[PDB]
Amino acid sequence: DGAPPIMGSSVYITVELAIAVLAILGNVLVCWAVWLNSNLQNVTNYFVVSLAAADIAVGVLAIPFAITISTGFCAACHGCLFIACFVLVLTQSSIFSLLAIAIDRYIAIRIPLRYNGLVTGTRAKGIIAICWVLSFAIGLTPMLGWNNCGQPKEGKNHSQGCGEGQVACLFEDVVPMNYMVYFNFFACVLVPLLLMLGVYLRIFLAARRQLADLEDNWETLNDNLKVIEKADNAAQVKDALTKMRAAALDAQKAKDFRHGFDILVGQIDDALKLANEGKVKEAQAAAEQLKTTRNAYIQKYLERARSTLQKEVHAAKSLAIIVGLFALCWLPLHIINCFTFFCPDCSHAPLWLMYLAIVLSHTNSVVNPFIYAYRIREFRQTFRKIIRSHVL
Ligand SMILES: CC(C)CCC[C@@H](C)[C@H]1CC[C@H]2[C@@H]3CC=C4C[C@@H](O)CC[C@]4(C)[C@H]3CC[C@]12C
Ligand SMILES: CC(C)CCC[C@@H](C)[C@H]1CC[C@H]2[C@@H]3CC=C4C[C@@H](O)CC[C@]4(C)[C@H]3CC[C@]12C
Ligand SMILES: CC(C)CCC[C@@H](C)[C@H]1CC[C@H]2[C@@H]3CC=C4C[C@@H](O)CC[C@]4(C)[C@H]3CC[C@]12C
Ligand SMILES: Nc1nc(NCCc2ccc(O)cc2)nc2nc(-c3ccco3)nn12
Ligand code: NA
């Protein structure tokens, strides 16, 4: 007695197939958008496409494999291992793509003038190819001998009636838990996720430091202007102009734009030469000209630089959400494996919970297209064009 297994199995399979359809459709849309729209064709989005391709493969291959292995069918043990482990190749490829995106955005905010000479489409393609090769080697490592094929469950294999060399193909019977916990979870998943967390933290800190510096230079200009306006001594004017000048050079370091800071620094130097030669009123008078240069050029370039940095912060937040949802969808299965491995006195997690955790991991292959659509205008607008035109 006990409910016929096919009833629970029918629910599981139906849900897996629903997820597969949505993973394929949404991620084909991502790839189509990058293909269509040259504004989306940049290095960051080559990693986005590599990630979308891994999620298409979850729907086309990993989900049919998961349905197959849920039956415990008789198979040659190394064929069984390939079906069991292929999803780990795809999840490792996703991890590498996510890590590359984070580093890409970190380079872009740290050394933006060197970014385009360092990070090229050709180098990115080589990186993607290497990461896919490494992904196959890591995810299929059990097929090199780190497996339980030498210790078959002969009770299961006779009750199912399997032949010679065949095992009942069940994940936990063939894939060792020490591989899943120490090698896959700790070294290959958790360590990269923590590195990604640290990279994103460094991105937000760099942005916050650059914004504060911008602001410091701005009020250094304005404060020292007031000093000159309230001064009554040549060297109180000269000293303020001197500090205004370094602030201006630092702002310029950090063509029409050049004309702005040239008028500004030229005007400072004019007022300085008057200051040195004792003419305080001529110096103060020359220094009030700076205000129209400030209003006409310097404020406009402060504003553009602030909004560029605010755009990069908003973009990095969007990409970090992707990483967060990856962790939220995969950590339950890893944590369950930790209980199975480290607590032999604990009852095994129940079968319904195992399959809920499996389904949750697969749902990760559905969500990224929705993030892009809600958070990234250029994707959203291109999705809209594709749907309205080629679908409506
Ligand atoms: C989509 C196309 C391009 C490639 C798909 C190939 C897949 C379906 C092939 C490649 C290797 C194959 C496996 C190789 C060995 C075995 C062991 C046997 O006892 C049962 C079948 C099984 C488990 C095969 C199932 C089908 C399989 C997984
Ligand atoms: C990352 C977020 C979503 C947290 C998810 C935590 C989940 C995976 C945790 C919270 C409570 C945990 C359960 C607590 C108690 C037991 C009983 C034990 O005999 C087997 C493990 C099992 C069944 C745990 C499995 C993992 C578990 C379900
Ligand atoms: C969230 C990320 C950053 C860290 C993940 C922490 C994981 C590794 C932690 C959280 C809860 C922990 C489990 C809590 C309780 C037990 C029961 C004990 O008898 C064996 C260890 C075991 C099973 C722990 C293993 C490690 C564990 C799963
Ligand atoms: N532990 C585990 N089991 C399964 N499937 C088998 C579930 C099960 C567990 C016990 C049992 O007697 C019958 C079925 N798939 C699994 N996939 C993973 C996985 C992928 C990434 C991290 O863990 N872990 N994992
Ligand atoms: Na993925």
Author numbering: -2 to 208, 1001 to 1043, 1059 to 1106, 219 to 308
Article, verbatim:
G protein-coupled receptors (GPCRs) are ubiquitous cellular gatekeepers in eukaryotic organisms. They mediate sensory stimuli and cell signaling, regulating all major physiological processes, and therefore have historically been primary targets in the pharmaceutical industry.
To demonstrate the general applicability of the described Complex-LCP method, we applied it to four other GPCRs: serotonin receptors 1B (5-HT1B) and 2B (5-HT2B), adenosine A2A receptor (A2AAR) and melatonin receptor type 1A (MT1). A2AAR is another prototypical GPCR, which similarly to β2AR has a large number of available ligands. A2AAR has been crystallized in complex with many different ligands, including the relatively large antagonists ZM241385 and comp-1, the agonist UK-432097 and some smaller, high-off-rate antagonists such as XAC, caffeine, PSB36 and theophylline. For example, in the case of A2AAR the transient ligand LUF5834 is likely to be exchanged with ZM241385 before crystallization, as no crystals were obtained when using LUF5834 alone.
